[PDB]
Amino acid sequence: ARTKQTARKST
Amino acid sequence: LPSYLKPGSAVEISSDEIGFRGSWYMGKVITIPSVKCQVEYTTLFFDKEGTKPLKEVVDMSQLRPPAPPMSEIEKKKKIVVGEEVDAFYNDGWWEGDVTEVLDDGKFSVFFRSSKEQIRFRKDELRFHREWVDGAWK
């Protein structure tokens, strides 16, 4: 369920 | 070619996309050939529905082997204010300082890239190691 989008911290 | 980059082998994955600074996410090498390979993340996906594991071409310098199994004494030594650690957060290892040790086995951890300050249980931390010139520091 975790993607780069919902894991990154910025931009 | 370095031993640990053989296709199929477990790796950790850095990045210089901003907002992944200080992180190491777990994955596997898919295709070795340029100075670049393609990996498959073990905990990220292309889609919220999580049907397609994320895959990505990176530089071999963004890769490192899995962190070494902590010995039993190492695996149980105390964690102290100022220790560098990696916390398991958003299904990835993030590096931070320990700023507070709390009475209940819990720690509070300062992340410098993200100005974040988050509590964790001991089993959510690991000791931060660096992987330089082929050896674990």
Coordinates of C-alpha atoms in Angstrom, one line a residue, chain A residues 2 6-7 9, chain B residues 12-13 20 22-27 41-44 86-95 111 120 124-126:
Chain A
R2 CA 3.1 2.1 0.5
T6 CA 3.2 7.9 0.5
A7 CA 6.8 7.4 1.7
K9 CA 9.1 13.4 3.1
Chain B
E12 CA 19.5 -1.7 0.7
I13 CA 18.7 1.3 -1.5
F20 CA 14.4 10.2 0.7
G22 CA 18.7 9.7 5.1
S23 CA 16.8 6.6 4.1
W24 CA 17.7 3.0 3.1
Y25 CA 14.9 0.9 1.7
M26 CA 15.2 -2.9 1.3
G27 CA 15.1 -4.6 -2.1
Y41 CA 11.8 -2.8 -3.6
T42 CA 10.6 -5.3 -1.1
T43 CA 8.2 -2.8 0.7
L44 CA 7.2 -0.1 -1.9
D86 CA 17.9 4.0 11.9
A87 CA 14.2 3.9 12.7
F88 CA 11.8 1.8 10.7
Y89 CA 9.3 4.4 9.4
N90 CA 7.2 4.5 6.2
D91 CA 8.4 0.9 5.7
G92 CA 12.0 2.0 5.4
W93 CA 15.1 2.7 7.5
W94 CA 15.6 6.4 8.3
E95 CA 18.7 7.8 10.0
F111 CA 15.7 13.7 12.0
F120 CA 10.0 4.7 18.7
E124 CA 11.9 -0.2 15.7
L125 CA 15.5 1.0 15.8
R126 CA 18.8 -0.4 14.5

